[PDB]
């Protein structure tokens, strides 16, 4: 769809929300009109000033333009979603949704990420050096958490059918980044959601959905490393997958401030270790570099205890294995842990 399509639509679009969007606002128990308009304006002084401080005053006009198109995208997708939702569950109100500041901050942030990313390289011009505001940047700007942001991505994508394949991919990668580390940082509401679940059952569709995507991503990466390093032993992987899967779910504190991939690599090693299969970390670490995520910092600088970081090998020996020693050994035991279902589709 002409790589310029959506941006074309956006450039043509009006700055004020449509008669129909305003109509959704007027049918809410609590009118969100004023809040959404003010938020748009407030986040505007903030996005524009932070953006300008990223690229410079000579480029003030570009921040405004990024913002303008992002807000148009915001209203556009918002309206799209409300129609899909009205249709989905025939209701028409939506006060609960439209009055949720977090929802609105995530739609906006996601819309700003699209406009931002499509013009990335162009913005990267007149930028250069150690100031390349990739993705987490936009979250940093709106004081918005990665776990919240992630909640709008799949929906945002299904709501804007004119996203370039290039934009679709970027949004997808953003969600992957969240899943691999951003969502597990100590400032992440995910931990309040988890603890809530471990405690009082029921609720949180967002956590259930989060994990579904983590497991899928987790397995995919795991499977890639196995196809490369463990062709000789196919029975592994499923066993490695089980420890990996069991660990994220029941040993999630291991993930706090750490990386999905660190737990993955440590799962592979540990299981090969008890199953008497070579596999040095040196090997694992080398294949890992073949993964779309893969950066060296991830196995070179691993959180140990305090703000103390060390090699992934130190993490494995001092924390990982020490924390999971007995579980790992159960895999080589007479009654092996029931294998965990491989994530599908």
């Amino acid at each position: 769809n002409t790589i310029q399509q959506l941006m074309m639509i956006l450039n043509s679009a009006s700055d004020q929300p449509s008669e129909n969007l305003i109509s959704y606002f007027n049918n809410c128990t609590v009118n969100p009109k004023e809040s959404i308009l003010k938020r748009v304006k407030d986040i505007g002084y903030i996005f524009k000033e932070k953006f300008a401080k990223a690229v410079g005053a000579g480029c003030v006009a570009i921040g405004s333009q990024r913002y303008k198109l992002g807000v148009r995208l915001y209203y556009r997708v918002m309206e799209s979603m409300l129609k899909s939702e009205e249709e989905r569950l025939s209701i028409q109100n939506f006060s609960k949704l439209l009055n949720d500041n977090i929802f609105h901050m995530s739609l906006l942030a996601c819309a700003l990420e699209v406009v931002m990313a499509t013009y990335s390289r162009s913005t990267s011009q007149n930028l250069d050096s150690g100031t390349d505001l990739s993705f987490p940047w936009i979250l940093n700007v709106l004081n918005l958490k990665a776990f919240d942001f992630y909640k709008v991505i799949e929906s945002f994508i299904k709501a804007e059918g004119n996203l370039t394949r290039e934009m679709i991919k970027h949004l997808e990668r953003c969600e992957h980044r969240i899943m691999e580390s951003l969502a597990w940082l100590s400032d992440s509401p995910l931990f309040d959601l988890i603890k809530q679940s471990k405690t009082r059952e029921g609720k949180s569709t967002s956590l259930s959905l989060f994990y579904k995507k983590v497991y899928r991503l987790a397995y995919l990466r795991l499977n890639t490393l196995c196809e490369r390093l463990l062709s000789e032993h196919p029975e592994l992987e499923h066993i490695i997958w089980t420890l990996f899967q069991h660990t994220l779910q029941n040993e999630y504190e291991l993930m706090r401030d750490r990386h999905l991939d660190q737990i993955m690599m440590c799962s592979m090693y540990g299981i090969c270790k008890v199953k008497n299969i070579d596999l040095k970390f040196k090997i694992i670490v080398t294949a890992y570099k073949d993964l779309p995520h893969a950066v060296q910092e991830t196995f070179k600088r691993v959180l140990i205890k305090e703000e103390e970081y060390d090699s992934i090998i130190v993490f494995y020996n001092s924390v990982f294995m020490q924390r999971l020693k007995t579980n790992i050994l159960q895999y080589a035991s007479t009654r092996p842990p029931t294998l965990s279902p491989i994530p599908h589709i």
Partner: peptide, 18 residues
């Protein structure tokens, strides 16, 4: 593509925000 469309049938964005 590796992306996982996680929303089950009829789940929508409303089921993700309060």
């Amino acid at each position: 593509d590796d992306y996982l469309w996680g929303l089950e049938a009829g789940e929508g964005i409303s089921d993700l925000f309060d």
